[PDB]
Symmetry: C2
Subunit: 341 residues, 2 copies
């Protein structure tokens, strides 16, 4: 999709302190060979205090993002809150809390689930919503937030390809103006890969209690065996190249003109990495930053863009590729042009 009137008016991350892979190895929580393979140096870790529940971190990130774009909360017509896991209280609309605290009483709020891709996918849904004439306002607030905890989640081991960081991020879209223009979005998808995210786990009538420790690495392996596809890996490559190519082509931008690409935090550590598939070197990606935060739920792309802007790592005229991807498997990409700093 080529966007003629869609802007990022603000972006922010609210992140707790860093905790190092080194300290996890020293404490016996993380196998040292795994630490070395994956290349992740540290991950953000929140306290267990109520003030650090995901919706409250999200509400703070939202305020920061709305403050920086000087958007009147009266002009926000939609709130989307994406996440991966528990929000602190069950049977309860977390998204309405985020909206109430950051914007106000009279804005429609949805929780969104598209696993790791939720932040990027929300951009398409919100952009469509803003252009449709449903709401009178010109902005949408997009938030993410998660805080991982035992017994269910071991941040260092529950996923093979990454390590989980706690925290929240926010991105405010506008059809009026902003410091960046969204030039394009495009989604690649292959829903056959959903099997890799459940493995041989049976459908249970009730959450399993007490919670065993999650092991998504082992789901992927069992998932691959049950699916018995001859071309598993290609299905991934195809959907990722589709998202990349359409996002670039609809933005009228060649890959050599991308100043920086913000990607999901993950690492194989052996052969080809995502950056090889994207056709650009490691140092033009957000890996150097991401390997300090870990995988911050659905918010890697918002947090990474926040990092670039806050540190003047981009200037006006630069084009930035935001690259999603999450279990499903779904990947939304976007090209953003910096207009003002």
């Amino acid at each position: 999709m080529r966007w003629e009137n869609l802007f990022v008016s603000g972006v922010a991350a609210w992140l707790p302190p860093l905790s190092t892979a080194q300290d996890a190895v020293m404490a016996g929580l993380l196998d040292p060979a795994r630490s070395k393979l994956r290349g992740i140096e540290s991950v953000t870790v929140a306290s267990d205090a109520e003030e650090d529940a995901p919706p409250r971190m999200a509400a703070r990130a939202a305020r920061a993002a709305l403050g920086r774009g000087d958007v009147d909360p009266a002009d926000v017509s939609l709130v989307l809150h994406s996440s991966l896991w528990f929000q602190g209280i069950d049977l309860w609309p977390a998204a309405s809390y985020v909206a109430h605290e950051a914007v106000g009483r009279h804005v429609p709020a949805f929780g969104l689930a598209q696993r790791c891709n939720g932040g990027m996918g929300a951009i398409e849904l919100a952009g469509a919503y803003l252009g449709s004439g449903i709401g009178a306002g010109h902005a949408a607030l997009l938030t993410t937030g998660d805080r991982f905890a035992g017994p269910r989640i071991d941040r260092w081991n529950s996923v093979d390809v990454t390590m989980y960081g706690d925290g929240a991020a926010a991105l405010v879209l506008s059809t009026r103006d902003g410091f960046a223009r969204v030039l394009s979005t495009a989604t690649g998808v292959d829903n056959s890969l959903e099997i890799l995210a459940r493995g041989d786990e049976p459908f249970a009538p009730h959450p399993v209690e007490p919670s065993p420790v999650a092991d998504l690495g082992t789901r992927t392996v069992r998932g691959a065996e049950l699916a018995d596809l001859p071309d598993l890996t290609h299905r991934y490559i195809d959907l990722l190249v589709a998202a990349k190519t359409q996002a670039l082509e609809d933005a009228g931008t060649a890959i050599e003109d991308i100043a920086h690409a913000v990607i999901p935090v993950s690492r194989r550590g052996t052969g080809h990495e995502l950056h090889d598939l994207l056709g650009l070197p490691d140092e033009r990606t957000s890996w150097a930053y991401g390997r300090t935060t870990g995988h911050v739920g659905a918010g890697d792309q918002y947090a990474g863009l926040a990092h670039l802007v806050e540190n003047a790592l981009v200037q006006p005229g630069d084009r930035v590729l935001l690259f999603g991807g999450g279990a499903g498997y779904t990947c939304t990409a976007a090209v953003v042009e910096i207009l003002r700093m």
Copy 2:
């Protein structure tokens, strides 16, 4: 919102067999007075077999809905799957399973949370998406699905205003054609009421284990206490009347021109009920149906419309109000006009 080119192409429910309120009373699971007050005659109860997990029930409803509307799955550009509770496997994309099983590999799928309003809120989001030019196809598949279980959920008692039914529903939107035209949608909202849905429950770092039995009625009371609002009654009235009023006006329709309103399944049993606020007698609402199914997660409005159409309770030229409402608090309403029977 007034819609120029939005249609309902198909609608369906997949519902497990009925379990009566009277049987629950006799098993000691439901108090006789509460049964009488609430007036729910029965609710749908699924088995605990893997085949009745919510995403599978949702897949069956989606396929029925798509088949009843002659929509090719290749023309669906978006799947939204709304729910209130556990889908059977954690840390996993349920919405992608629904999409794969009913529609295919190459359609973006999202899980959607807007408590009891998810099904109606999904119509606005999908409608916007379909008109935007983002996806190639002309149709969107909307699903709901839940299956409630102990210890956490006691379907008969965990919500005061209703009793939960298991099952799934589906609705297919199209920019091209269908059996009904969506004339309008409108949302009323008041996010200050989110506190009523959490009460004084502390934010916990991990789900509380073992799960105690949920008591949302007590949460409402604890939340009302903390919030200390001067005008709670008026907050409900203002947002519900706003949704009703805007949907009717954008559709160019008066309440007396509404043949039927499909409403959330809930009941006070004393005083004024939602139908009084809508200005409709009981008989012009979905209550006669909803009191046999109970509150089927986010799917009451889809399920109620399917029942209307499957049983020839409306005919071409009739207008129907689909009326939402859920904890948040958010209520999305739509006026649809029947163009032909499917």
